[PDB]
């Protein structure tokens, strides 16, 4: 609760001085810079959505195949918070099989999608999941079948139940798809409240629990909206875990996160929203 007070005070000071842009640029300046050799290999060029968004070598997810283990995905491991997330780009038409291979191999229970397939007339992500029950998808390169089991469309987000089957073994797994449909690219959710309800729904599902593989989180690039979501979740969690006397430094936590994947949170206003969500979330809880 001491942490709640200090964070509100910090928020108000930043807000009054109009320092969000400067503080965000400071974070960009001091963010970790690690090699992305595998990502930059010529043969992986068509596996990357954006030339300026790559996974670091040290934290990238490796596909368990022998010919090419590369996917644009990173493991964010928050030690104190005991949270792990896989942040990845919105799959390309040729990497949908890879995406679901990763989900299978990493034993993820949930996938958090923070974008729409089409945004402002532009394709931002492949249609990597089935839209009708009787029309399943088969990914021949990775030998997986994907079936839409059910779908619940709400005003701010959609929750789906998917069934992923390893065709090689005929083993099946239930995957939860949490699709936030009202979060504009390079923007913020319509309110802290609707963001928090979404986050709480993801939390309640067990998808973030140590008993499962890490949740898969993605937007178009897997850094802007994806970064905002994970930062808020982790910081909210730390607000609860840490006893007085304590504080939660959102800037430090974000820098910690950026050790695992570049460019997490893409605008100063997304950073500001992160503060708001954590502050409001903590008050509610
Ligand atoms: O989807 C997000 O929230 C996100 O970070 N998107 C990003 S990050 C990023 C781009 C995009 C994009 O969507 O066009 C394009 C240029 N490079 C950086
Ligand atoms: Cl969509
Ligand atoms: Cl950046």
UniProtKB/Swiss-Prot annotation:
Residues that bear Cysteine sulfinic acid (-SO2H): 219
Subunit structure, as described in the record: Interacts with EPHA3 (phosphorylated); dephosphorylates EPHA3 and may regulate its trafficking and function. Interacts with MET. Interacts with NCK1.
Keyword Membrane: yes
Organism whose genome encodes this protein: Homo sapiens (Human)
UniProt record, GO biological process: actin cytoskeleton organization; cellular response to angiotensin; cellular response to fibroblast growth factor stimulus; cellular response to hypoxia; cellular response to nerve growth factor stimulus; cellular response to nitric oxide; cellular response to platelet-derived growth factor stimulus; cellular response to unfolded protein
Residue numbers of Phosphoserine PTMs: 54, 246-247
Residue list for modification Phosphotyrosine: 24, 70
The protein's name in its UniProt record: Tyrosine-protein phosphatase non-receptor type 1
Entire protein: shown range: 1 to 281 of 435
Keyword terms: Acetylation, Endoplasmic reticulum, Hydrolase, Membrane, Oxidation, Phosphoprotein, Protein phosphatase, S-nitrosylation
Function summary: Tyrosine-protein phosphatase which acts as a regulator of endoplasmic reticulum unfolded protein response. Mediates dephosphorylation of EIF2AK3/PERK; inactivating the protein kinase activity of EIF2AK3/PERK. May play an important role in CKII- and p60c-src-induced signal transduction cascades. May regulate the EFNA5-EPHA3 signaling pathway which modulates cell reorganization and cell-cell repulsion. May also regulate the hepatocyte growth factor receptor signaling pathway through dephosphorylation of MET.
Top class in the EC scheme: hydrolase
GO molecular-function term, one example from the UniProt record: ephrin receptor binding
Top-level taxon of origin: Eukaryota
Placement of covalent cross-link N,N-(cysteine-1,S-diyl)serine (Cys-Ser): 219-220
């Amino acid at each position: 609760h001491m942490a709640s007070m200090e964070m509100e005070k910090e928020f108000e000071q930043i807000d009054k001085s109009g320092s969000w842009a400067a503080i965000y640029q400071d974070i960009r300046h001091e963010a970790s810079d690690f090699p992305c050799r595998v990502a930059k290999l010529p043969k992986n060029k068509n596996r990357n959505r954006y030339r300026d968004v790559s996974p670091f070598d040290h934290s990238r997810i490796k596909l368990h195949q022998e010919d090419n283990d590369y996917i644009n995905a990173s493991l964010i491991k928050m030690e104190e918070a005991q949270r792990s997330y896989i942040l990845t780009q919105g799959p390309l038409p040729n990497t949908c099989g890879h995406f679901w291979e990763m989900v299978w191999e990493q034993k993820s229970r949930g996938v958090v999608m923070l974008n729409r397939v089409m945004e402002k007339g532009s394709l931002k992500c492949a249609q990597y999941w089935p839209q009708k029950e009787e029309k399943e998808m088969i990914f021949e390169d990775t030998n997986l079948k994907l079936t839409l089991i059910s779908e619940d469309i709400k005003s701010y987000y959609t929750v789906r139940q998917l069934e992923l089957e390893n065709l090689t073994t005929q083993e099946t797994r239930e995957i939860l798809h949490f699709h936030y449909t009202t979060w504009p690219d390079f923007g913020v959710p319509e309110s802290p409240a609707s963001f928090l309800a979404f986050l709480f729904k993801v939390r309640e599902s067990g998808s973030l629990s140590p008993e499962h593989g890490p949740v898969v989180v993605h937007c178009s690039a897997g850094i802007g909206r994806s970064g905002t979501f994970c930062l808020a979740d982790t910081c909210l969690l730390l607000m609860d875990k840490r006893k007085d006397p304590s504080s939660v430094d959102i800037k430090k936590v974000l820098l910690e996160m950026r050790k695992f994947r570049m460019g997490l949170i893409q605008t100063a206003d997304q950073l500001r929203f992160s503060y708001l969500a954590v502050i409001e979330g903590a008050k509610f809880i």
